[PDB]
């Protein structure tokens, strides 16, 4: 039985996650879930406390702990340990009776836990994008330290690329570490879009989108701050670097391309030229369930892909004058040193302020482009702890640049 | 580097392997063509000896394998072992030095170096499929007796599911046995066919096409029979047995699926219900190659899959009506014991019949219908010898019985 910890379980893939867990429970007992970690939403925390039993309860926002332990007393025959914040978070990761993390906490505050979770030799199933986009070449480094850890990607697209991999060589390597690609015999990497809400609209029609028509994802239902990457396609921007960490492959070897009906997920070019590609309908429980039970495959009560009903797949490129971020998140990715954790920042501050009605579609981009501008490369700290500090720094550095433009402007 | 025998060489498929043997030899030299073996076509024999220059030359029509030896003698500096018939064909088998056969000959009659390459333990590239569907049980046999033989599909269809699993997976069992696809967790199998060139063709038009109309294969170049095949969707039918064969996987497991393009080549659906699919343009070179590489990949020149390009993939429901050969097949299939050798030999006769404009398009599948309602099934022979007559009775005995039918209907 596979023991699993859910971090963020309260949020779109942690309820995906806990979804395709149940159902797989269904028949044989296959999933432990051993702990559960959100930040603030005691409630509905609760009502999962209750479903699944987890020996851990966690909650990262100290004021509603009270809150937590008060709820969980109604419960019978049941005493979980409950814990707080960083601490907490910790303690879950240092316990021998997890073995396989869930990371479905959003933004940069999801590289905490990764961290700890690898500094712990877990298994950690990877939907958190933004840690690997800041912290690509600290996580390499932490993971050639803490060799029984492994990074299994949970992202759609990471996932799809990932499972059109031959497994036999998959097992002679491990994401994150040099030469992957090379062992792959990976020559090019397909990454799949929806496009998002806004793929047909015209220039003068994109500069007034607000961010209500923006939250409309035509086939994703998912958490408020990927949606809006998802509508300038910053959502494919972070995922071309988080392709280039993962799977070592060259910036000039990842092409976009916008697949409205969301089947194919992704579709990797071996060097031979034959290309091999996943699909299913758009529906996370897949990745999820993947990341868990890699390298095998388990039996599901999915509904079945139809194809024939499906009936149509739609390939085209996308217009990088229309979404300006996808070229942004290459050059930053290009530039390699400390650019994507600014390019990270800058985005985290420039979709929260669209989310919230104060900047413009095309303001976003600006934002990004200067805080880019503005950065100077440093010189990379050799030691991981010097390197984190470094990447708070810079992190917590351009979200403040980024925050100033807005400011100097509005 | 890899020591291959060519059969059937001056056919489609066995240029094709030349093709793509020279052209990746041009990269990196890793392909020893040790020999080469043909029906008739002794000059283009000659021809291709002169390019290569195999150790073993072979001839099956022995009214021209003196003249063989008298072009040869032209090739300076060359003394290869040429040889003829049935015998050449064993001695070729048997020699050490040859590690991996393409079997491009075509019909039942490929059936012959197929299990005597399986005897002799070579990693056989197989794209005769009619071995297979008429003597799938008996090859099942032979390649339990001889462990270190390996069928690889060359159909594309096949070699495309083949290309989508894990080889970690694969390396515990091998194609053509018993649990292939439990071991490798498949639940089911998209077989995608160009649909032929009579796919928008009404009943009433169907009633009067020429075998002329036929021959003209939107997007496959390959010999008369095949195509022939591909047009009254009987090639499909054929494939569906091949799969069932070569993966064990259930007919019920098993959907037809039209696909236009032609650039998705087939798609496996695992237990969990993910789905994978292999992909590229209508070229034999791949599957051909990956037959030889197996389970590596090597470096090509191939134009890569331009999926902007292609721009839509199209998938519908095959109309069982239109193309009453693909339902033959399943019943065939279904049935079991002798019935697919029964299916195979009457189509060859039916296939021919059409060919030559000696009967109409439904007449084929009534033919073929009327010999499988004609057979009764028949025990199934214990010793590998006795079993392998069995087949050679029932093929012969289908061909004349299909030959009866069209005799008296004229
Ligand atoms: N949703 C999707 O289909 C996909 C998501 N992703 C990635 O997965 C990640 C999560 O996305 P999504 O599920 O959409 O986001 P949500 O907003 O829906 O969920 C975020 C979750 O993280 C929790 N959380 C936030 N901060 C903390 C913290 N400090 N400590 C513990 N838990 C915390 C939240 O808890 P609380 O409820 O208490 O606020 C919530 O449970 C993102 O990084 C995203 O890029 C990637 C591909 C697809
Ligand atoms: N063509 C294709 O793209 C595909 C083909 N297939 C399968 O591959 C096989 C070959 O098809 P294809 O290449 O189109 O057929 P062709 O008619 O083009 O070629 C047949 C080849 O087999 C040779 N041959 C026939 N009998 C003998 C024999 N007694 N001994 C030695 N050689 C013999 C012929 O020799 P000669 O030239 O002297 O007559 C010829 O070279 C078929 O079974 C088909 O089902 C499967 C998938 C795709
Ligand atoms: O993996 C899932 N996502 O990242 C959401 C995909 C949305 P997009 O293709 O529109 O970015
Ligand atoms: O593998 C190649 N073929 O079998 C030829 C495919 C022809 P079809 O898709 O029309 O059956
Ligand atoms: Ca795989
Ligand atoms: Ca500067
Ligand atoms: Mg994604
Ligand atoms: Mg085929």
Same mark, same amino acid.
């Given at each position: ?6 971090f963020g379980?309260?949020?779109?893939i ?86 396989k993390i869930v990371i479905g906490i959003?933004?940069?505050?999801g590289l905490?836990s990764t961290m700890?979770a690898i500094?712990?030799?877990k298994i950690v199933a990877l939907a958190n994008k933004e840690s690997i986009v800041?912290?690509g070449?600290?996580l390499?480094?932490?993971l ?5 850890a492994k990074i299994i990607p949970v992202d759609?697209?990471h996932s799809?690329?990932f ?12 994401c994150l ?30 500069? &007034?989108?607000?961010?209500? %028509?923006?939250?409309?994802?035509? /086939?994703? @239902? ?5 949606? $809006?990457? =998802? ?11 988080e392709?280039?960490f993962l ?40 990745p999820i369930?993947?990341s ?54 800058? &985005?985290?501050?420039?979709? %929260?302020?669209?989310?919230?009605? /104060?900047? @413009? ?5 600006? $934002?990004? =482009? ?41």
């Amino acid at each position: 039985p596979i023991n699993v910890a859910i971090f963020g379980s309260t949020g779109s893939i942690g309820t995906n996650a806990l979804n395709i867990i149940r159902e797989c429970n269904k028949i044989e007992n296959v999933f432990n879930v051993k702990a559960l970690y959100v930040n603030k939403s005691v409630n509905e925390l609760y009502e999962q406390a209750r479903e699944f039993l987890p020996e851990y309860l966690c909650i990262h926002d100290k004021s509603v702990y009270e809150e937590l332990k008060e709820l969980v007393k109604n419960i019978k025959d049941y005493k979980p340990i409950i814990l707080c914040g960083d601490e907490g978070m910790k303690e879950i990761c240092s316990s021998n009776s997890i073995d396989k993390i869930v990371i479905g906490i959003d933004s940069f505050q999801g590289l905490y836990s990764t961290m700890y979770a690898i500094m712990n030799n877990k298994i950690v199933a990877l939907a958190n994008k933004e840690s690997i986009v800041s912290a690509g070449f600290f996580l390499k480094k932490l993971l050639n330290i803490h060799k029984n850890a492994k990074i299994i990607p949970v992202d759609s697209e990471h996932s799809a690329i990932f499972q059109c991999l031959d497994n036999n060589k998959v097992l002679k390597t491990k994401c994150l570490q040099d030469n992957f690609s090379k062992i792959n015999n990976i020559n090019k990497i397909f990454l799949c879009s929806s496009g998002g809400p806004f793929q047909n609209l015209t220039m003068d029609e994109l500069k &007034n989108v607000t961010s209500e %028509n923006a939250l409309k994802h035509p /086939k994703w @239902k998912m958490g408020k701050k990927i949606t $809006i990457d =998802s509508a300038t396609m910053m959502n494919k921007g972070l995922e071309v670097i988080e392709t280039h960490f993962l799977f070592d492959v060259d910036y000039n070897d990842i092409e976009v391309i916008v697949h409205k009906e969301c089947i194919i997920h992704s579709c990797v070019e071996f060097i031979d030229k034959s290309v091999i590609s996943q699909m299913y309908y758009p529906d996370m429980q897949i990745p999820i369930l993947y990341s868990l039970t890699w390298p095998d495959r388990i039996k599901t009560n999915l509904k079945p892909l139809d194809l024939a009903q499906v009936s149509t797949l739609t390939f085209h490129k996308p217009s990088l004058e229309h979404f300006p971020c996808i070229k942004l998140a290459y050059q930053a990715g290009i530039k390699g040193n400390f650019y994507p954790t600014v390019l990270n920042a800058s &985005n985290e501050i420039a979709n %929260n302020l669209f989310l919230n009605n /104060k900047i @413009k579609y095309f303001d976003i981009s600006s $934002i990004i =482009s200067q805080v880019l501008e503005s950065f100077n490369s440093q010189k990379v700290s050799e030691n991981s702890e010097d390197l984190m500090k470094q990447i708070l720094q810079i992190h917590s550095w351009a979200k403040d640049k980024a925050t100033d433009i807005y400011n100097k402007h509005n």
